[PDB]
């Protein structure tokens, strides 16, 4: 009944800002402490959060993202069939003009990156890496990296032909953060498959290989 009431408060999109902040804070508080309530009421909560991400009020969005971060951090398994949507919405939230929202979105992206099934994440992210606008592609590459850190050698190896084009073309991007992100992602691949990576990088210039090798040696120590 308490959950239903909080849920009823949260259904008022773009209105009752203070009361809904209170409701969200209460949601987070309860999330920190029942465990079996989610089995019946999770999905509605998720849906409402994702709707509230589109709010006119920035702070409501940021708070919503912090809440999503907590829910992800406590009970990840229930996101299994909703990963692609969640990723997309979060990455979208990275394009917000308000800095606090982007920050909370980056935190949420980190935990999401440590929660979601890795294969599907990569598979979803590839066209996003290739086609999304700055800085969505940036957050997507970062997340892809954090995912690569959790994959097996065999699986990564099998997924490489799909992963690589985005990283190679992305390395030629004009935005410093993107190039840096691609270098780091390559470093993370190298951490897993080692020398086997080298034939995939035949299309890079010597300068870029220098830059990559430096960060590899840096990552080793």
């Amino acid at each position: 009944d308490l959950v239903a009431e909080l849920l009823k408060e949260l259904s008022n999109h773009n209105e009752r800002v203070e009361e809904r902040k209170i409701a969200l804070y209460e949601l987070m508080k309860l999330t920190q402490e029942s465990f079996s309530v989610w089995d019946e009421h999770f999905k509605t909560i998720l849906l409402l959060l994702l709707e509230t991400l589109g709010d006119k009020e920035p702070t409501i969005r940021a708070l919503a993202l912090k809440v999503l971060r907590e829910i992800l951090r406590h009970q990840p398994a229930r996101f299994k069939n909703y990963a692609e949507l969640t990723v997309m919405k979060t990455l979208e939230a990275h394009k917000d003009p308000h800095k606090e929202v982007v920050r909370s979105a980056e935190e949420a992206a980190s935990v999401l990156a440590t929660s979601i099934s890795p294969e599907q994440c990569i598979k979803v992210l590839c066209p996003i890496i290739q086609t999304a606008d700055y800085p969505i592609n940036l957050a997507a590459i970062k997340m892809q990296t954090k995912v690569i850190e959790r994959v097996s050698k065999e699986t990564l190896n099998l997924l490489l032909p799909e992963i690589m084009p985005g990283l190679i073309q992305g390395y030629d991007n004009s935005e410093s953060s993107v190039r840096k992100a691609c270098v780091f992602c390559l470093v993370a691949v190298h951490a897993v498959i080692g020398d086997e990576l080298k034939p995939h990088l035949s299309q890079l210039t010597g300068s870029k290989m220098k830059l990559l090798n430096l960060y590899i040696k840096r990552a080793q120590t």
Partner: protein
């Protein structure tokens, strides 16, 4: 006849005087008990009042201290965020430096 009545009178009067004295002592005991009741009542009153004030102050310090803890943890979180931002900014600058280092030579 008459003598018996006189003797009965005297005895009855003695009993009366004894009863008067007895009643006076009992009224004294009543006064004593009453004062005792008043005293212990006042003691109970002071105990209740004092306990109330004491509890109020302790709860005040409790809530103040709680507010301080909450605020401090919030500020700590904010400092951690700022810390992270500064760290990645450093990292970024270093990357640019290495990149220029390869361009120039």
């Amino acid at each position: 006849s008459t003598t018996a009545l006189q003797e009965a009178l005297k005895e009855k009067q003695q009993h009366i005087e004894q009863l008067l004295a007895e009643r006076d002592l009992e009224r004294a005991e009543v006064a004593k008990a009453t004062s005792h009741v008043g005293e212990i009542e006042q003691e109970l009153a002071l105990a209740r009042d004092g306990h109330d004030q004491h509890v109020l102050e302790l709860e005040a310090k409790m809530d103040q201290l709680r507010t301080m803890v909450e605020a401090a943890d919030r500020e700590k979180v904010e400092l951690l965020n700022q810390l992270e931002e500064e760290k990645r900014k450093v990292e970024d600058l270093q990357f640019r430096v290495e990149e220029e280092s390869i361009t120039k030579g």
